[PDB]
From a paper:
Eukaryotic gene transcription is carried out by three RNA polymerases: Pol I, Pol II and Pol III. Here we present the cryo-electron microscopy (cryo-EM) structure of a mammalian Pol II dimer at 3.5 Å resolution. The structure differs from the Pol I dimer and reveals that one Pol II copy uses its RPB4-RPB7 stalk to penetrate the active centre cleft of the other copy, and vice versa, giving rise to a molecular handshake. The Pol II dimer is incompatible with nucleic acid binding as required for transcription and may represent an inactive storage form of the polymerase.
The dimer is formed through a handshake-like interaction between the stalk of one Pol II copy and the active centre cleft of the other copy. In our dataset, we could also classify two more distinct states of the Pol II dimer that display a rotation of one Pol II copy with respect to another, leading to slightly different locations of the C2 axis. There was no cryo-EM density for the clamp domains in any of our reconstructions and no significant protein degradation was observed for either RPB1 or RPB2 by SDS-PAGE, indicating that the clamp is mobile.
Residue numbers in the entry:
A (entry chain S), K (entry chain G): 1 to 171
B (entry chain L): 15 to 58
C (entry chain A): 860 to 910
D (entry chain A): 360 to 459, 467 to 487, 498 to 525, 537 to 657
E (entry chain B): 471 to 529
F (entry chain A): 1365 to 1420, 1467 to 1487
G (entry chain P), L (entry chain D): 14 to 142
H (entry chain F): 49 to 127
The structure:
């Protein structure tokens, strides 16, 4: 889910960037450190809107690197547990549907999929279709799923979804 | 392996990593004649 | 409806004190069915002391 | 151990609790069993069979928890097992399986063909096998079909069978009584001894009724004025069902009398 | 659908009910009198999408 | 009925409405099952909508081993 | 220990205001425009591109006026901020769908009033053709 | 003592007691009753319940937190 | 540019990663000729990727049904790369599990 | 179904 | 340091030991599990004096292993931080003295040793001796040291000592 | 977060009573005697042997009577249980040594009274020859 937050990030600036208008270098540096990354607590930081303020630069003893606490406004994508949200299917395998909820990728297990659905390796391309053929989930298909749980791995958030709940599927 | 053109139906030997085209036609679809290893069929 | 009803009564059970309680241990009914008898063994009959 | 779903077909011969399963599906499914001296030889032979033969074991688990695949069979010593081991022997006859939150357990019977067999009394299903002995014992004690509880092809014939018109010759009676599991072994005395023996349908059905259960029911085509008339006990149309000492003395059975309801032979017997 | 020749013919003449506000407000699933001689009444897929998909009449 | 007669009266009214629809087609359901549904909804003193989530255990007793009863017994082997 | 259905989550996100998928696309577009031309910097991260496609594909509104109208319409009610974006992003067809997908709404919204809100969103969401 | 639970044994208790005992028997556990060739572990435990020899003691947890120790032999089973 | 797909027999030596299956069915060109019976898990077309030694990525039978390849077609796709299609023919005998339906009902 |  | 404690240990008993007087097997089993081990919280369990009582054996569902909570009296060796205690030298190296405080082994760093001390590789056997030769620390020498800190590794407690404090040495 | 000098340690050890190195040897000997002969079991763990040598080497008392006398003598005072074994195990020569080694004693013990306690321990500890 998308939110508007005010976060704090300590920026490490090399003394080489102590030239005129060094604040510009700090401002542009913040567009690379917290931009495009995925903090495990607040989720993916997709973009940064503006900068609130830049704190005083404290020089760390011994290290010689000035620390600049800067406050900025950014939008994060934090998947809350037990939240239903639309997703896009990127691939389908016997294990289960592989979905894509925005920047992150959510995996759907076969057990979580309703029993009526049955994987078909013959059909080109693969798509979980039930016997009645009423509902079929192809690749790049907009489907709604509920995230039972989320786990953080290697500075990334991996989500697990399910469709056992009512009104989860193509609609 | 030996293939068959889908237009003239003539034998044309095509090797590995070779363009697929019939010399007599230029036709771009080729078929395989048959395998020399016979199978067993039971009338059931 | 079937799925909804089960979820709201999944935790409802009869404890060893002949009382119906949920997971939170709240007393839903003092005695199961207000009599404390199973619904399978009961048989239909008509007592003839009122008609 | 979820199995591959397959279509369902009927099988009157199988008991309602029993379920038919193909060899191929049972081969994939495995049931971990703790080996004991009383059945050490039984596991010794089954593991020797191998995975190529249907009565085999997919894996064998030692005390330390190591799993050895039986497909390869590298050494005969590794094949040998000690007491306390766990062997994932393939499903065989007599095992308990559970399928469709209330689920009914069933006793698996191996049949040649592929489709599942169920004694209904179509849609695909997947049968689940309880690996643990504790839950297997619990399932067979409370989740079995008898504790959970007739086809339309039998009720229609039952009404005709119990009709007073039906008369069974000695030859016909023999075949019917052969299929009767709850038979004392003694042929009942014919209702019409002369000029020739002729057992009525009720007499054969009397042995079908278990023990001594008494109940009174009425046929669907039972005139209301018949009960008020002098012929209430001797029904002109045999529309009154009465059972005494487990014997169907009179009346044509139907869904009202034999089918599940507030009062019925099956319900009273239960 | 090339499973059967009849299926192929039906698919080519297949019709779809309107979607969105127009379809939502109306009752495309229900069989109307105007279908007489124009859209086959009996032919309709079974399921939730019953009556939404139809087939053109022969003539 | 809740705002006029109270939650207690709703339990009987809810039973009647539930039984009325169930008995309309001739089907019958044991009163104990029907009473349980009404009691759970009114258990908190106010009408509660049945859990809309609809996603969908023998632990009230524990078996304990006794050494006194194990003093007797011979191993099968 | 957090669950969206029960409206339990870290206290930090309480101050944050939710954003719509279509609205975020505008913010991403503003970020994309300046980076592409305003300053000579490295190409945008793959994460930024991935979310841009997701927002564009699921964008339920054409222009800011439609987005603002829905935001203003839902702000008048007691809708929680978490439900503000979730309802608009999901676009439930009817009231029954929204409550099942959003358990929170059932707590303080009736079957009739909410239906009058979802249908309003339908009149705002624009279809391709 | 001062036990207020029903003297009879519930079906759930019977199923678990036999199941747990049967699992124990399969793990080289001793059998109190005489063995007359019953190989299947469930049968061994079934007759043990009939003879009232199962060492298992049922601890029924009351909803208030109290527990009552009811022996399988003490409980009245149905045969 | 570095890695490309090719059609050839995935020999156990030249290929590092492979799946346990019978490879005698494939011919010198990596394509099974028409008339060969195929049953269970069997490779019917040989494809390998020259990862930066090659890794086997052949295609096996979708199911375990026993069938005989009917005809084999070798072509060039729109991109110009070699492209082939093969039709596996199997005979199904009606049995107890097949579903039969009348013209109505 | 079974072969799958 | 040595203490007298009453600890709780859940004993896992196989059903094979369900024979007559099974309590004896539980009692003897406790003399192998908690005896000779080293818990990271209470230190080395050098010996067990007696058994207080044996709790009711609860059968774990599914597993089939009966759990026996047993209370026993035992003596532990827990090295408290910042505690001075005598030690025995087992080896000497350029890095520093290697001491042995009862069951565990404590290592003394060269820096912690007083500057007056100087390692002598010539002397047979090695022994940290100062220039004045007044005090010499040979192997198997009773010396007093203060444990600055302790760390738990691989189910064992490793202690670090120092001699900078007064009255630490041969005396 | 625990320090012996400041008398801070886990609350569990408060109930425990300290033991002397020589006294522990007796307990180990009792454990050793039964294992060696009373029951046929596996040989004692290497940890048990290692501590047995440590206690025997640093055993400051010959028999139980000497151990009991010191324990009783120190029990009459307000000595903390942690200091009870530590003082006896260390056997400080003089009062000044004990306080520096044991910071706690300096809090509630004077330079004169404690000296009268350490010298008593000296009269109890037995030398080889
Ligand atoms: Zn040609």
């Amino acid at each position: 889910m998308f939110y508007h937050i005010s976060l704090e990030h300590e920026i490490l600036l090399h003394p080489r960037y102590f030239g005129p208008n060094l604040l510009n270098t700090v401002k542009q540096k913040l567009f690379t450190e917290v931009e495009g990354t995925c903090t495990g607590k607040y989720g993916f930081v997709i973009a940064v809107t503006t900068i609130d303020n830049i704190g005083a630069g404290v020089i760390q003893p011994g290290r010689g690197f000035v620390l600049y606490p800067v406050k900025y406004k950014a939008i994060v994508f934090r998947p809350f547990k037990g939240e239903v949200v639309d997703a896009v299917v990127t691939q389908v395998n016997k294990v289960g549907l592989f979905t894509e909820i925005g920047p992150m990728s959510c995996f759907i297990s076969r057990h979580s999929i309703p029993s009526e659905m049955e994987f078909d390796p013959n059909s080109n391309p693969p798509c979980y279709k039930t016997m009645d053929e009423d509902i079929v989930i192809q690749q790049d298909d907009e489907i709604r799923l509920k995230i039972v749980g989320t786990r953080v791995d290697k500075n990334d958030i991996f989500a697990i979804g399910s469709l056992m709940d009512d009104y989860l599927g193509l609609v | 392996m030996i293939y068959i053109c889908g237009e003239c139906h003539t034998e044309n030997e095509i090797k590995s990593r070779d363009p697929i085209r019939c010399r007599e036609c230029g036709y771009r679809i080729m078929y395989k004649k048959r395998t020399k290893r016979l199978v067993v069929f039971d009338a059931r | 409806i079937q799925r909804r009803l089960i979820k709201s009564m999944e935790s409802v059970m009869v404890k060893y004190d002949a009382t119906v309680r949920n997971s939170i241990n709240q007393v839903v009914q003092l005695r199961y069915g207000e009599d404390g008898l199973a619904g399978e063994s009961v048989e239909f009959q008509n007592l003839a002391t009122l008609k | 151990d979820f199995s591959a779903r397959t279509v369902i077909t009927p099988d009157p011969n199988l008991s309602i609790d029993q379920v038919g399963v193909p060899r191929s599906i049972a081969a994939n499914m495995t049931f971990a069993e703790i080996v004991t001296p009383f059945n050490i030889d039984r596991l010794q032979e089954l593991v020797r069979r191998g995975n190529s033969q249907y009565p085999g074991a997919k894996y064998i688990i030692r005390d330390n928890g190591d799993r050895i695949d039986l497909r390869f069979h590298p050494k005969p010593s590794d094949l040998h097992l000690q007491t306390g081991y766990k062997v994932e022997r393939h499903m065989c006859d007599g095992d308990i399986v559970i399928f469709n939150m209330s689920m009914m357990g069933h006793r698996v019977r191996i049949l040649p063909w592929s489709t599942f067999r169920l004694n209904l009394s179509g849609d695909e299903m997947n049968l689940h096998l309880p690996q643990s002995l504790e839950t297997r014992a619990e399932i067979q004690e409370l989740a079995m079909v008898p504790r959970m509880i007739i086809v339309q092809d039998t009720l229609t014939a039952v009404r005709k069978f119990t009709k007073r018109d039906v008369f069974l010759e000695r030859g016909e009676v023999m075949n019917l009584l052969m299929f009767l599991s709850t038979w004392d072994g003694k042929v009942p005395q014919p209702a019409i001894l002369k000029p020739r023996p002729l057992w009525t349908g009720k007499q054969i059905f009397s042995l079908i009724i278990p023990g001594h259960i008494n109940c009174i029911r009425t046929h669907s085509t039972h005139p209301d004025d018949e009960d008020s008339g002098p012929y209430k006990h001797i029904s002109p149309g045999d529309t009154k069902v009465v059972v005494e000492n487990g014997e169907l003395i009179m009346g044509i059975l139907c869904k009202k009398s034999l089918g599940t309801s507030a009062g019925s032979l099956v319900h009273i017997s239960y | 659908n090339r499973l059967t020749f009849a299926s192929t013919l039906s698919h080519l003449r297949r019709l779809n009910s309107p979607i969105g506000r127009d379809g939502k407000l109306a009752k495309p699933r229900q069989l109307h009198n105007t279908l007489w001689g124009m859209v086959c009444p009996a032919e309709t897929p079974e399921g939730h999408a019953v009556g939404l998909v139809k087939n053109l009449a022969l003539m | 009925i809740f705002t006029v007669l109270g939650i207690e009266a709703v339990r009987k009214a809810l039973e009647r409405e539930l039984y009325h629809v169930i008995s309309f087609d001739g089907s019958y359901v044991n009163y104990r099952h029907l009473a349980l549904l009404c009691d759970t909804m009114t258990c908190r003193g106010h009408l509660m909508a049945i859990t809309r989530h609809g996603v969908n255990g023998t632990g009230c007793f524990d078996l304990l081993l006794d050494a006194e009863k194990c003093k007797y017994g011979m191993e099968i082997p | 220990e957090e669950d969206a259905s029960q409206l339990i989550f870290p206290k930090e996100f309480e101050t944050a205001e939710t954003l719509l998928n279509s609205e975020v696309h505008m913010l991403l577009e503003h970020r994309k425009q300046q980076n592409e031309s305003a300053e000579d910097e490295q190409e945008l991260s793959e994460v930024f591109m991935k979310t841009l496609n997701y927002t564009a594909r699921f964008s339920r509104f054409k222009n800011r006026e439609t987005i603002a109208s829905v935001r203003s319409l839902l702000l008048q009610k007691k809708l929680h901020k978490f439900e503000l974006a979730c309802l608009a992003n999901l676009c439930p067809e009817t009231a029954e769908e929204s409550k099942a997908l959003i358990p929170s709404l059932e707590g303080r919204f009736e079957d009739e009033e909410l239906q009058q809100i979802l249908d309003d969103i339908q009149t705002k969401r624009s279809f391709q053709y | 003592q001062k036990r207020i639970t029903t003297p009879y044994m519930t079906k759930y208790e019977r199923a678990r007691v036999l199941g747990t005992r049967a699992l124990q028997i399969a793990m080289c556990a001793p059998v109190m009753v005489e063995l007359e060739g019953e190989t299947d572990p469930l049968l061994i435990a079934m007759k043990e319940l009939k003879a009232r020899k199962i060492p298992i003691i049922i601890r029924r947890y009351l909803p208030d937190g109290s527990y009552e120790d009811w022996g399988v032999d003490e409980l009245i089973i149905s045969d | 540019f570095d890695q490309e797909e090719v059609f050839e027999k995935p020999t156990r030596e030249t290929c590092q990663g492979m799946r346990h299956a019978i490879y005698d069915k494939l011919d010198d060109d990596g394509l099974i000729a028409p008339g060969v019976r195929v049953s269970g898990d069997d490779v019917i077309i040989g494809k390998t990727v020259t990862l930066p030694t090659k890794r086997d990525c052949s295609t096996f039978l979708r199911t375990s049904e026993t069938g005989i390849v009917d005809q084999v077609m070798v072509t060039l796709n729109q991109e110009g790369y070699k492209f082939c299609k093969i039709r596996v023919r199997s005979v199904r005998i009606p049995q107890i599990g097949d579903k039969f339906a009348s013209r109505h009902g | 179904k079974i072969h799958s």
